[PDB]
Amino acid sequence: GLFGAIAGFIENGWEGMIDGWYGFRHQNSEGTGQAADLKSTQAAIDQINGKLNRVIEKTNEKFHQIEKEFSEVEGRIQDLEKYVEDTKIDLWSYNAELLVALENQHTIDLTDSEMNKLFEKTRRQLRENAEEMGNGCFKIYHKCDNACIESIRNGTYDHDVYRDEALNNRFQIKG
Amino acid sequence: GLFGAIAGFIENGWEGMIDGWYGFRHQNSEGTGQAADLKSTQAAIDQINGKLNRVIEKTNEKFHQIEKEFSEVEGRIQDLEKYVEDTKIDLWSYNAELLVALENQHTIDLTDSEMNKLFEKTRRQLRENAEEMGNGCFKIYHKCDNACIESIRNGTYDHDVYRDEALNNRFQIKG
Amino acid sequence: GLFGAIAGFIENGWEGMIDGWYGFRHQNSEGTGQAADLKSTQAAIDQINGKLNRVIEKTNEKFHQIEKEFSEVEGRIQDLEKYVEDTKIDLWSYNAELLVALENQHTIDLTDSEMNKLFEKTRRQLRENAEEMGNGCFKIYHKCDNACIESIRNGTYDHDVYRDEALNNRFQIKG
Amino acid sequence: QDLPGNDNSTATLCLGHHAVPNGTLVKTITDDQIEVTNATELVQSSSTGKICNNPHRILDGIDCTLIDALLGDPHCDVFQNETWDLFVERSKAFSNCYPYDVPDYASLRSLVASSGTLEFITEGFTWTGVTQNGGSNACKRGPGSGFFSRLNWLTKSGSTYPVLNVTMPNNDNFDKLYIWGIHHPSTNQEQTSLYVQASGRVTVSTRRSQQTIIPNIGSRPWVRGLSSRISIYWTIVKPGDVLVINSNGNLIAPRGYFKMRTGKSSIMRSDAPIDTCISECITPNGSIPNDKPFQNVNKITYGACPKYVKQNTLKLATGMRNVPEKQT
Amino acid sequence: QDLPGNDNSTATLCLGHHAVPNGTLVKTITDDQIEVTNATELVQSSSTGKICNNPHRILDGIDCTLIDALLGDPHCDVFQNETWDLFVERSKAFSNCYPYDVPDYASLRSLVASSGTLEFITEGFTWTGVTQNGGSNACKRGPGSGFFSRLNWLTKSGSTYPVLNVTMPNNDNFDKLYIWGIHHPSTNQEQTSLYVQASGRVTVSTRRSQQTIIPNIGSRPWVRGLSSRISIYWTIVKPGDVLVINSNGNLIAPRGYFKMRTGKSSIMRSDAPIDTCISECITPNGSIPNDKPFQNVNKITYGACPKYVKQNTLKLATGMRNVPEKQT
Amino acid sequence: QDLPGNDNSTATLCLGHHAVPNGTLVKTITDDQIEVTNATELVQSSSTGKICNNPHRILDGIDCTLIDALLGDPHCDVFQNETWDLFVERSKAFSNCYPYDVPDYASLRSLVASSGTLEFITEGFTWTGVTQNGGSNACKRGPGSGFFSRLNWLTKSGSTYPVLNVTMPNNDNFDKLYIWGIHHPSTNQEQTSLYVQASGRVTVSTRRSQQTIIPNIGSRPWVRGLSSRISIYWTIVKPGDVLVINSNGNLIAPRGYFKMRTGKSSIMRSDAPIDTCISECITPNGSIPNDKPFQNVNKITYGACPKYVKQNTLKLATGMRNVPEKQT
Ligand SMILES: CC(=O)N[C@H]1[C@H]([C@H](O)[C@H](O)CO)O[C@@](O[C@H]2[C@@H](O)[C@@H](CO)O[C@@H](O[C@H]3[C@H](O)[C@@H](O)[C@H](O)O[C@@H]3CO)[C@@H]2O)(C(=O)O)C[C@@H]1O
Ligand SMILES: CC(=O)N[C@H]1[C@H]([C@H](O)[C@H](O)CO)O[C@@](O[C@H]2[C@@H](O)[C@@H](CO)O[C@@H](O[C@H]3[C@H](O)[C@@H](O)[C@H](O)O[C@@H]3CO)[C@@H]2O)(C(=O)O)C[C@@H]1O
Ligand SMILES: CC(=O)N[C@H]1[C@H]([C@H](O)[C@H](O)CO)O[C@@](O[C@H]2[C@@H](O)[C@@H](CO)O[C@@H](O[C@H]3[C@H](O)[C@@H](O)[C@H](O)O[C@@H]3CO)[C@@H]2O)(C(=O)O)C[C@@H]1O
Ligand SMILES: CC(=O)N[C@H]1[C@H]([C@H](O)[C@H](O)CO)O[C@@](O[C@H]2[C@@H](O)[C@@H](CO)O[C@@H](O[C@H]3[C@H](O)[C@@H](O)[C@H](O)O[C@@H]3CO)[C@@H]2O)(C(=O)O)C[C@@H]1O
Ligand SMILES: CC(=O)N[C@H]1[C@H]([C@H](O)[C@H](O)CO)O[C@@](O[C@H]2[C@@H](O)[C@@H](CO)O[C@@H](O[C@H]3[C@H](O)[C@@H](O)[C@H](O)O[C@@H]3CO)[C@@H]2O)(C(=O)O)C[C@@H]1O
Ligand SMILES: CC(=O)N[C@H]1[C@H]([C@H](O)[C@H](O)CO)O[C@@](O[C@H]2[C@@H](O)[C@@H](CO)O[C@@H](O[C@H]3[C@H](O)[C@@H](O)[C@H](O)O[C@@H]3CO)[C@@H]2O)(C(=O)O)C[C@@H]1O
Ligand SMILES: *[C@@H]1O[C@H](CO)[C@@H](O[C@@H]2O[C@H](CO)[C@@H](O[C@@H]3O[C@H](CO)[C@@H](O)[C@H](O)[C@@H]3O)[C@H](O)[C@H]2NC(C)=O)[C@H](O)[C@H]1NC(C)=O
Ligand SMILES: *[C@@H]1O[C@H](CO)[C@@H](O[C@@H]2O[C@H](CO)[C@@H](O[C@@H]3O[C@H](CO)[C@@H](O)[C@H](O)[C@@H]3O)[C@H](O)[C@H]2NC(C)=O)[C@H](O)[C@H]1NC(C)=O
Ligand SMILES: *[C@@H]1O[C@H](CO)[C@@H](O[C@@H]2O[C@H](CO)[C@@H](O[C@@H]3O[C@H](CO)[C@@H](O)[C@H](O)[C@@H]3O)[C@H](O)[C@H]2NC(C)=O)[C@H](O)[C@H]1NC(C)=O
Ligand SMILES: *[C@@H]1O[C@H](CO)[C@@H](O)[C@H](O)[C@H]1NC(C)=O
Ligand SMILES: *[C@@H]1O[C@H](CO)[C@@H](O)[C@H](O)[C@H]1NC(C)=O
Ligand SMILES: *[C@@H]1O[C@H](CO)[C@@H](O)[C@H](O)[C@H]1NC(C)=O
Ligand SMILES: *[C@@H]1O[C@H](CO)[C@@H](O)[C@H](O)[C@H]1NC(C)=O
Ligand SMILES: *[C@@H]1O[C@H](CO)[C@@H](O)[C@H](O)[C@H]1NC(C)=O
Ligand SMILES: *[C@@H]1O[C@H](CO)[C@@H](O)[C@H](O)[C@H]1NC(C)=O
Ligand SMILES: *[C@@H]1O[C@H](CO)[C@@H](O)[C@H](O)[C@H]1NC(C)=O
Ligand SMILES: *[C@@H]1O[C@H](CO)[C@@H](O)[C@H](O)[C@H]1NC(C)=O
Ligand SMILES: *[C@@H]1O[C@H](CO)[C@@H](O)[C@H](O)[C@H]1NC(C)=O
Ligand SMILES: *[C@@H]1O[C@H](CO)[C@@H](O)[C@H](O)[C@H]1NC(C)=O
Ligand SMILES: *[C@@H]1O[C@H](CO)[C@@H](O)[C@H](O)[C@H]1NC(C)=O
């Protein structure tokens, strides 16, 4: 949508991920692993539910109204009774049709947003120690065991601890 | 608009570009050149047309309705016939005026988005070999002939092929 | 909101800042200081005022209308007079409630946008001489006195002037 | 730091989002079928088919319409002094007493319908000089001839129908609804046989208003053996006002007043079954749940109901775009 | 990998977007003139000035209004049994037969207008004891005096106007519309010359209803030589019901029934030319194209038309912001 | 290049945004209380309690309703030929002349209300054979018996009430509104004492229409000593048309015409004080400022007013989210 992460730079979703809406897959010293991110999953869910509750906020109640069905033909007054109701129905139908259209558009952009925000958040954390491979995967340039991967995920990763190892691996090489 | 590329970090448009909506201009070892990007141009056009068709989706038809013009003065019932229509017209006029306002705001943000997405996409591709001069132009730090510029444009640019040349040019220098 | 700067990567606002809406706080070898950015402050204010004026654009005037209060019980025609007005009020109340809801959502995203755009603008300017600490603060890697901080703020900072000092401080170190 | 930290390996971390094999298409500002992870339906489009008898007071009219219940057609005597939040009128209802017509039937039905009560008070009208309690074989009450329970057909006594001039003060603190009528004879002979004068006249008035109706002699279609008709009229008398009924023939006199109230009561024509279940929204197709914001069951509703909409389905996306990883 | 790249140069790649010299201003949530690359108009604001005669059946009323066509004013005899999707009534239409008034003209015009047919069936009413086919010099049919083709003016026979009491059963499976009337004489002398009784009375009824009208003697303004008037009334008889016409003077009798239908027909007052072209939307200003969503031509419309709006222009941006490079 | 000389150091630059200690909660698409830096109220919810007498012409009816002012009840003689943008009717208004009723009071009040003028022109009607200027003790004009200033009660002269047949041509280029009426006697003896004929009749007509009303004898409730009533009727005569009044008894004759206009005038029932201040929007609760887009003061309004809404508060955020340093 607006941010270009979902159905954008992240090529596709993972049907495999069943424990949350956004998350990580790694490949490190002990192998490969997946894990849902629960903060962005909750952020997306809370917003969509907020949106959802506002739309289910109170049906107004109506009691005695006008007649809306007639068996004889009466002319002027009955023509107006029918017209008031038909122009009421068309106005409410328009409102329903535009309401879900705006809402839907916003939900796709909102979730695109959260994906991209998680990406940015992980980028910022990794600092000079990783490079964006451009498909939503960071190449981390230093030995990163499973506890290292877990510190990136739970947000305690200290970049300094690996900055020299990473900068050597990343730049120095032979050019 | 929301992303700050159009009429933002990209100082202005190019009246010169007549073959698409977004695109590249470059200067390299072999001379200078311009070229529209057709994927982002199509993305922006398809969205705007989708938007456009939904707005032209079926005029509802109406046959016998109420009278809306009168030559004599009748009082109570005619006062209501006139009031039902006038409050109908004001409600539909409001809807038209808010509909184009929302739509228009969204179109300027949507196209701002696509520009910025193309920028991001090119950034990601160039990897460690270029630097953002901050005006929507990347300074590429290695010899890049016309076929090199073409591979960035058509998305096949292999950054590795030039990473050492680029990293030398970019960092080493004298500090 | 959509960009994740306000109430996002920037942990909170500064009640201390009273001279504008967005701005800078710095710590260098001469001291510390704060200063509002007036371009982004004006951008945010102008948009919100534009939005505001369109909503206060002309009350339409109405003169003779229908009766909306009755003391005797009349049946069919009075039931319709009451129904036309009640369905009018509900339609206008719906419009007001959706209008402020859309508007408000947009205002929080629009201001989130401006914050993030100021951040991006400063990032682009600093080039290879600073690193994003991930909380909206750049670590500048070179001696930056108060006139240096002022040139970043007023947009005249020449990165080249400090590129070698910065690149040495930033990379070389011991890895 | 350490000493020569030499283990030059790398790691890869990829961010992503879920996808479901199934997915649901929803409409958007820019596309009208875009597939999302999940959506929810906002249009309620199906009734239970039964009118739940709770929380509102539903009064099933069975084979009486509300006006026959009001007038007191013999077969509707069940309904006297009854009350309701919603009177349900059935397609099968039938009238079976003296042929009558009501000039603004539509307003009288409305008026009573939303008052919500048929509570009748009898008042001591004194008709001097005429015969009371007239009835007819078309309005059989049991074995005998009868008439509407709430109306009183006056005819001549001996050889005279005097000019009736009665009054009934509204001394209470509420409005009083009076239902009265006039009898249109089939023949001039009938007019004189019953009311002596060859032209009746009924004038009912208060301080604020007056109605004078004059009968209309002539044959109408045989309805339950009769070509005559009576037409029904109504007068509301406000507190402190006074009713004066003045007639010189053909009057169908009131027996007292229905008391009017102000509430949430209304009437609904429906042949749906009433059932014991609790439901706030009633539609002539049966009750429907007001959990969704819009409904497509019926434009006629009573109670806390969703807004009727022309559309039968409107799905609100509740999840991200679905970009599957195959689709299995 | 590769060998010494002796020269080590740089390149510049810049991204950008188009701009047009011209551009169009559009309204926004935050600005009300922002210039964009391109926009499209959503308000249709101009008619062709001609009513296209396709796809709907347009019936040009020429100098007849629909009620005169219905009653059968001589000069409107062209329209008998005609049909339409849209009857167009012209400002120039004129009546030119016996002076009449129609108590609820507005509903009778509506009623007929949306039925969409003037198909008349003649039925065998038998008036015994009166003279039929009365006409007048104000309703000239050819050289002679005449009257509305669909009505039948009865007067006395010799020295008597008996009490007419006729019946006509609706045995078909459709509704039958009957148009009848009453003649109001100018003088009491006129009343007796034509109908003998000094006070007429017309009662038309079915099982469901009745109307009794009594004439009103007195001079009105001279209209085509006459101070008298006839007033028009209508009765619909449903399948299985029965019409009973009972009168004792002043009746203008029906000659049969117009048959009613249910369709998309309506009436429109317009002096726009009809032309041969196909257009779904008709406005009294002429047909307009329903390609745009909203229109500002006229609030009166028939067919698939854009929603009328107060605004005369609403531009939907279809392109990005226009940020050109030159000066102004 | 630039030569550092000696210092080796770093700086920190942080970007941020303001926050306020206080803050205001606003509704959103996704949350319904989110706190923002600042908001503004869009619902005007309070009146000044006084109707400003500027810029519209407010006419305070004091203790006259507009129909009594029109008819010319003695105590309303203040209002003759008066004009208004808004006639304010007070709860205290009372009638104090001959008991009258107006069949479509509601339309006559509307009709006059929006014409905005009570300018009366007297025309030379010549009633030959009847007594003019009748009045009553229930409509005291000063010490004497009187009647409505704009109506003329005719009674017999000597022993005859002839058949009145008068005409008044509309020769001017504007519509003329005529207010006339009929007197309903309490007794047949009264009918003959005043109008000789035992049954009156009033027929008022133009080329386009006619009304015939026949009186209705009978007792109504004593109102200012009387059981009789007069009912008010109105006829508009268009340019080039002609009024013909024809009666044979019980006519309350017009004395000329009110002239009608077309404007922005209307009527409002309110007991709010009029005051000297300028305000475009009037509500029966007093004037309200139309600076905000919506109002919750009253659904009845006159002038440039905000749209009435059910909500009493709707705040539009005018600032960013409030994320304070300590708490809120
Ligand atoms: C949806 C619909 O059917 N609307 C009808 C209504 C309903 O039938 C009615 O409201 C049910 O309560 O009837 C309307 O017509 C009535 C009207 O013609 C009056 C006379 O003016 O008569 C009613 O029928 C009577 C009949 O005349 C009596 O002899 C009999 O004793 O009772 C009958 C009713 O049960 C007509 O129904 C209406 O005005 O309300 C026409 C609507 O189109
Ligand atoms: C927009 C508009 O002009 N509305 C008028 C209509 C139209 O003129 C009419 O619908 C065209 O079909 O007329 C309304 O008034 C009619 C009403 O006064 C009746 C009598 O109650 O008479 C009509 O004129 C007759 C005239 O009386 C006959 O003598 C003559 O033979 O034919 C004339 C019609 O052609 C009035 O037009 C209406 O109620 O429909 C008033 C609307 O304001
Ligand atoms: C909100 C409201 O009160 N609506 C009433 C109105 C208003 O009272 C009226 O518009 C004020 O101008 O009155 C309505 O009823 C009137 C109606 O019954 C007619 C007769 O058909 O009489 C009016 O009262 C008269 C009374 O009959 C006269 O004897 C007396 O000289 O003057 C009185 C008026 O001042 C009733 O008010 C109406 O139809 O307009 C009923 C609304 O519910
Ligand atoms: C208070 C009272 O008078 N009750 C009478 C009624 C009324 O006289 C009658 O409703 C006035 O409209 O009449 C009752 O007898 C009538 C009944 O037998 C019917 C059945 O058809 O016929 C009436 O006489 C008819 C006669 O049968 C027809 O053939 C003829 O063409 O016309 C006559 C018109 O009067 C009877 O009067 C009744 O039960 O309705 C007896 C009540 O006690
Ligand atoms: C069935 C029938 O009676 N046809 C007559 C009609 C009717 O008698 C008449 O329409 C009833 O309203 O009258 C016809 O003659 C009338 C015609 O000559 C007009 C022309 O003005 O005058 C009528 O008499 C007038 C008289 O001319 C006036 O000066 C006088 O003041 O009043 C008289 C009122 O009766 C003629 O009756 C006709 O053509 O309309 C002849 C039809 O055959
Ligand atoms: C033009 C004219 O006739 N003015 C008379 C009126 C009218 O005669 C009267 O309004 C017709 O409705 O009558 C005036 O006197 C009446 C007045 O004294 C009232 C007071 O109650 O009484 C009327 O007679 C009553 C009588 O008082 C009752 O007890 C009895 O039951 O009925 C009688 C019915 O006529 C007086 O006629 C008047 O002031 O209104 C005198 C006017 O000059
Ligand atoms: C005026 O004309 C009408 C219509 O012609 C006459 O109505 C008809 O009157 C007869 C005799 O009363 C009715 O007959 C009875 O009908 C029932 C049902 O069919 C049947 O059981 C009886 O044995 C008898 O046939 C007839 O139904 C009735 N028809 C209609 C449509 O109402 C009326 O009598 C005439 N009146 C006068 C005074 O001339
Ligand atoms: C009742 O009063 C009305 C109005 O005064 C009388 O109407 C007028 O009657 C005369 C004679 O019939 C009409 O004369 C006609 O004038 C036309 C030209 O406009 C002429 O061509 C005819 O030959 C005829 O002479 C006059 O037009 C008519 N005016 C109006 C406004 O209707 C009516 O005659 C009186 N009736 C009685 C019984 O007193
Ligand atoms: C028809 O019946 C009505 C109601 O019974 C009669 O009305 C009443 O008539 C009397 C005598 O005219 C009225 O009395 C007067 O009342 C005033 C006020 O108290 C008083 O000042 C007089 O001295 C006298 O007592 C009474 O108010 C009136 N009541 C009503 C409700 O209108 C009417 O008179 C009867 N008419 C005939 C011809 O029988
Ligand atoms: C983050 O992960 C590391 C490795 O599992 C662990 O030591 C640390 O405590 C974790 N912190 C949190 C907040 O989970
Ligand atoms: C991209 O450009 C290079 C140079 O023109 C060419 O060899 C390559 O095949 C192009 N790829 C595509 C998909 O156009
Ligand atoms: C920016 O700041 C520097 C240091 O104060 C100053 O020399 C320069 O002129 C400033 N430029 C502007 C446009 O304020
Ligand atoms: C789809 O959305 C609705 C509303 O949020 C929710 O009740 C439902 O459980 C969702 N489906 C799944 C599989 O989460
Ligand atoms: C509800 O009832 C109406 C009329 O009885 C019928 O046409 C409609 O289709 C029904 N809809 C549903 C959902 O039952
Ligand atoms: C402007 O937009 C409309 C609708 O998308 C399109 O038909 C028209 O061709 C556009 N103009 C140009 C120059 O592309
Ligand atoms: C009108 O149509 C009917 C029905 O077919 C027909 O019998 C009648 O004679 C037609 N009359 C004319 C004048 O066309
Ligand atoms: C259409 O017709 C109406 C009334 O005939 C006129 O006032 C209006 O201005 C016309 N508008 C157009 C676009 O023709
Ligand atoms: C809050 O917003 C309104 C409208 O923009 C403005 O008048 C008001 O001054 C604002 N409050 C502050 C403290 O800026
Ligand atoms: C009312 O205005 C008319 C028209 O100028 C005038 O002739 C008439 O005498 C005025 N009457 C009063 C009482 O002001
Ligand atoms: C305005 O007046 C109405 C009726 O007089 C009253 O119910 C309402 O509450 C009042 N509201 C205000 C804001 O004065």
mmCIF file with all atom_site columns, C-alpha atoms and ligand atoms in Angstrom, chain A residues 69-72 74, chain D residues 65 68 89 95 100-103 105-106 109 269, chain E residues 207-208, ligand 1:
data_model
loop_
_atom_site.group_PDB
_atom_site.id
_atom_site.type_symbol
_atom_site.label_atom_id
_atom_site.label_alt_id
_atom_site.label_comp_id
_atom_site.label_asym_id
_atom_site.label_entity_id
_atom_site.label_seq_id
_atom_site.pdbx_PDB_ins_code
_atom_site.Cartn_x
_atom_site.Cartn_y
_atom_site.Cartn_z
_atom_site.occupancy
_atom_site.B_iso_or_equiv
_atom_site.pdbx_formal_charge
_atom_site.auth_seq_id
_atom_site.auth_comp_id
_atom_site.auth_asym_id
_atom_site.auth_atom_id
_atom_site.pdbx_PDB_model_num
ATOM   1  C CA  . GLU A 1 69  ? -46.039 -0.275 1.775  1.00 0.00 ? 69  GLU A CA  1
ATOM   2  C CA  . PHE A 1 70  ? -49.485 0.563  0.297  1.00 0.00 ? 70  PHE A CA  1
ATOM   3  C CA  . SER A 1 71  ? -52.191 -1.501 -1.428 1.00 0.00 ? 71  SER A CA  1
ATOM   4  C CA  . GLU A 1 72  ? -54.338 1.175  -3.118 1.00 0.00 ? 72  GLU A CA  1
ATOM   5  C CA  . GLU A 1 74  ? -53.556 7.396  -3.887 1.00 0.00 ? 74  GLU A CA  1
ATOM   6  C CA  . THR D 2 65  ? -57.374 -5.129 12.456 1.00 0.00 ? 65  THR D CA  1
ATOM   7  C CA  . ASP D 2 68  ? -62.097 -3.139 14.311 1.00 0.00 ? 68  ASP D CA  1
ATOM   8  C CA  . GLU D 2 89  ? -51.917 -6.883 12.026 1.00 0.00 ? 89  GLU D CA  1
ATOM   9  C CA  . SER D 2 95  ? -64.362 -7.461 9.606  1.00 0.00 ? 95  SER D CA  1
ATOM   10 C CA  . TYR D 2 100 ? -68.394 1.037  7.816  1.00 0.00 ? 100 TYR D CA  1
ATOM   11 C CA  . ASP D 2 101 ? -65.799 3.235  6.153  1.00 0.00 ? 101 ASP D CA  1
ATOM   12 C CA  . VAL D 2 102 ? -63.432 5.637  7.813  1.00 0.00 ? 102 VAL D CA  1
ATOM   13 C CA  . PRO D 2 103 ? -62.673 8.824  5.861  1.00 0.00 ? 103 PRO D CA  1
ATOM   14 C CA  . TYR D 2 105 ? -58.559 5.519  7.986  1.00 0.00 ? 105 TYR D CA  1
ATOM   15 C CA  . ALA D 2 106 ? -54.861 6.006  7.609  1.00 0.00 ? 106 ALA D CA  1
ATOM   16 C CA  . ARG D 2 109 ? -55.070 3.784  12.469 1.00 0.00 ? 109 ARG D CA  1
ATOM   17 C CA  . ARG D 2 269 ? -48.436 -5.719 9.299  1.00 0.00 ? 269 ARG D CA  1
ATOM   18 C CA  . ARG E 2 207 ? -67.460 -2.421 -1.276 1.00 0.00 ? 207 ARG E CA  1
ATOM   19 C CA  . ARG E 2 208 ? -64.480 -0.533 0.101  1.00 0.00 ? 208 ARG E CA  1
HETATM 20 C C1  . LIG G 3 .   ? -49.989 -2.060 3.049  1.00 0.00 ? 1   LIG G C1  1
HETATM 21 C C2  . LIG G 3 .   ? -51.473 -1.814 2.933  1.00 0.00 ? 1   LIG G C2  1
HETATM 22 O O1  . LIG G 3 .   ? -52.207 -2.779 2.802  1.00 0.00 ? 1   LIG G O1  1
HETATM 23 N N1  . LIG G 3 .   ? -51.968 -0.582 3.029  1.00 0.00 ? 1   LIG G N1  1
HETATM 24 C C3  . LIG G 3 .   ? -53.388 -0.276 2.850  1.00 0.00 ? 1   LIG G C3  1
HETATM 25 C C4  . LIG G 3 .   ? -54.154 -0.151 4.149  1.00 0.00 ? 1   LIG G C4  1
HETATM 26 C C5  . LIG G 3 .   ? -54.241 -1.384 5.052  1.00 0.00 ? 1   LIG G C5  1
HETATM 27 O O2  . LIG G 3 .   ? -55.047 -2.365 4.449  1.00 0.00 ? 1   LIG G O2  1
HETATM 28 C C6  . LIG G 3 .   ? -54.832 -0.983 6.395  1.00 0.00 ? 1   LIG G C6  1
HETATM 29 O O3  . LIG G 3 .   ? -54.110 0.088  6.966  1.00 0.00 ? 1   LIG G O3  1
HETATM 30 C C7  . LIG G 3 .   ? -54.838 -2.124 7.398  1.00 0.00 ? 1   LIG G C7  1
HETATM 31 O O4  . LIG G 3 .   ? -55.170 -1.534 8.632  1.00 0.00 ? 1   LIG G O4  1
HETATM 32 O O5  . LIG G 3 .   ? -55.537 0.205  3.898  1.00 0.00 ? 1   LIG G O5  1
HETATM 33 C C8  . LIG G 3 .   ? -55.817 1.453  3.257  1.00 0.00 ? 1   LIG G C8  1
HETATM 34 O O6  . LIG G 3 .   ? -57.182 1.474  2.760  1.00 0.00 ? 1   LIG G O6  1
HETATM 35 C C9  . LIG G 3 .   ? -58.329 1.409  3.636  1.00 0.00 ? 1   LIG G C9  1
HETATM 36 C C10 . LIG G 3 .   ? -59.423 2.415  3.234  1.00 0.00 ? 1   LIG G C10 1
HETATM 37 O O7  . LIG G 3 .   ? -59.875 2.172  1.912  1.00 0.00 ? 1   LIG G O7  1
HETATM 38 C C11 . LIG G 3 .   ? -60.626 2.314  4.180  1.00 0.00 ? 1   LIG G C11 1
HETATM 39 C C12 . LIG G 3 .   ? -61.827 3.195  3.801  1.00 0.00 ? 1   LIG G C12 1
HETATM 40 O O8  . LIG G 3 .   ? -61.406 4.484  3.417  1.00 0.00 ? 1   LIG G O8  1
HETATM 41 O O9  . LIG G 3 .   ? -61.094 0.967  4.190  1.00 0.00 ? 1   LIG G O9  1
HETATM 42 C C13 . LIG G 3 .   ? -60.140 -0.049 4.498  1.00 0.00 ? 1   LIG G C13 1
HETATM 43 O O10 . LIG G 3 .   ? -60.778 -1.339 4.439  1.00 0.00 ? 1   LIG G O10 1
HETATM 44 C C14 . LIG G 3 .   ? -61.805 -1.606 5.428  1.00 0.00 ? 1   LIG G C14 1
HETATM 45 C C15 . LIG G 3 .   ? -63.201 -1.689 4.813  1.00 0.00 ? 1   LIG G C15 1
HETATM 46 O O11 . LIG G 3 .   ? -63.571 -0.473 4.190  1.00 0.00 ? 1   LIG G O11 1
HETATM 47 C C16 . LIG G 3 .   ? -64.211 -1.984 5.933  1.00 0.00 ? 1   LIG G C16 1
HETATM 48 O O12 . LIG G 3 .   ? -65.489 -2.185 5.367  1.00 0.00 ? 1   LIG G O12 1
HETATM 49 C C17 . LIG G 3 .   ? -63.785 -3.204 6.711  1.00 0.00 ? 1   LIG G C17 1
HETATM 50 O O13 . LIG G 3 .   ? -64.676 -3.308 7.791  1.00 0.00 ? 1   LIG G O13 1
HETATM 51 O O14 . LIG G 3 .   ? -62.439 -3.112 7.180  1.00 0.00 ? 1   LIG G O14 1
HETATM 52 C C18 . LIG G 3 .   ? -61.457 -2.904 6.158  1.00 0.00 ? 1   LIG G C18 1
HETATM 53 C C19 . LIG G 3 .   ? -60.046 -2.842 6.775  1.00 0.00 ? 1   LIG G C19 1
HETATM 54 O O15 . LIG G 3 .   ? -59.771 -4.028 7.501  1.00 0.00 ? 1   LIG G O15 1
HETATM 55 C C20 . LIG G 3 .   ? -58.953 0.016  3.555  1.00 0.00 ? 1   LIG G C20 1
HETATM 56 O O16 . LIG G 3 .   ? -58.009 -0.965 3.902  1.00 0.00 ? 1   LIG G O16 1
HETATM 57 C C21 . LIG G 3 .   ? -55.543 2.642  4.223  1.00 0.00 ? 1   LIG G C21 1
HETATM 58 O O17 . LIG G 3 .   ? -55.898 3.773  3.916  1.00 0.00 ? 1   LIG G O17 1
HETATM 59 O O18 . LIG G 3 .   ? -55.030 2.444  5.329  1.00 0.00 ? 1   LIG G O18 1
HETATM 60 C C22 . LIG G 3 .   ? -54.955 1.499  1.990  1.00 0.00 ? 1   LIG G C22 1
HETATM 61 C C23 . LIG G 3 .   ? -53.501 1.093  2.153  1.00 0.00 ? 1   LIG G C23 1
HETATM 62 O O19 . LIG G 3 .   ? -52.911 1.006  0.868  1.00 0.00 ? 1   LIG G O19 1
#
